[PDB]
Design a protein around this ligand. Structure first.
Ligand SMILES: Nc1nc2c(ncn2[C@@H]2O[C@H](COP(=O)(O)OP(=O)(O)O)[C@@H](O)[C@H]2O)c(=O)[nH]1
Ligand SMILES: [Mg+2]
Length: 179
């Protein structure tokens, strides 16, 4: 079986840990974990061959900036996340996450992931953003950002509803196999 390492990065509260949990497990207890602290793998078949993906979670808050690069050695694919309910998290993609990953993971493919797709049409989300004259991220803004940062692709998903999640890991596997 082919062995590849995936790392997930992005602002806090954007759904990173949930994305890793929903694709790897059938049940998760009632506990909040900042990062997956157990060895989670994704077993994916692509083009008629079996790939095993080690999934490495990170903490996006600034207090962790100094220790986060311990997760980067020998990465084969990056999932770089923002949340569709947070325009601020999208702004941090070119400003923080892109230069950090390009430094520690040179030439490693990046999948830009717009998480929490279910909140784009959520009434409560729309009201909370609207009160500050904001709105959910539009798909065209994510495509534009993937062009700006040189990502391998842009995908949207919801760890909550599961929509789009399998496709994220399949494209990440395809990307990891190119090099
Ligand atoms: N509505 C919605 N909430 C989500 C989704 N994914 C995660 N969440 C919630 O967002 C919060 C943060 O998720 P988490 O995975 O801990 O984010 P992380 O800080 O990036 O690891 C939690 O309350 C999750 O239950 C989603 O697709 N839709
Ligand atoms: Mg987390």
């Amino acid at each position: 079986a082919i062995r590849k390492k995936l790392v997930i990065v992005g602002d806090g509260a954007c759904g990173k840990t949930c994305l890793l949990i929903v694709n790897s497990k059938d049940q998760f207890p009632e506990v909040y974990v900042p990062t997956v602290f157990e060895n989670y793998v994704a077993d994916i078949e692509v083009d008629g061959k079996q790939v095993e993906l080690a999934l490495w979670d990170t903490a996006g808050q600034e207090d962790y900036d100094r220790l986060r690069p311990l997760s980067y050695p020998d990465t084969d694919v990056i999932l770089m996340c923002f949340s569709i309910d947070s325009p601020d998290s999208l702004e941090n993609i070119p400003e923080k996450w892109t230069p950090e990953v390009k430094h520690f993971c040179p030439n490693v493919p990046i999948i830009l992931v717009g998480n929490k797709k279910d909140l784009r049409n959520d009434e409560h989300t729309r009201r909370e953003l609207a009160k500050m004259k904001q709105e959910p991220v539009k798909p065209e803004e994510g495509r534009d950002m993937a062009n700006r940062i040189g990502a391998f692709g842009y995908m949207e998903c919801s760890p909550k509803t599961k929509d789009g999640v399998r496709e994220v890991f399949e494209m990440a596997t395809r990307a990891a196999l190119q090099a």
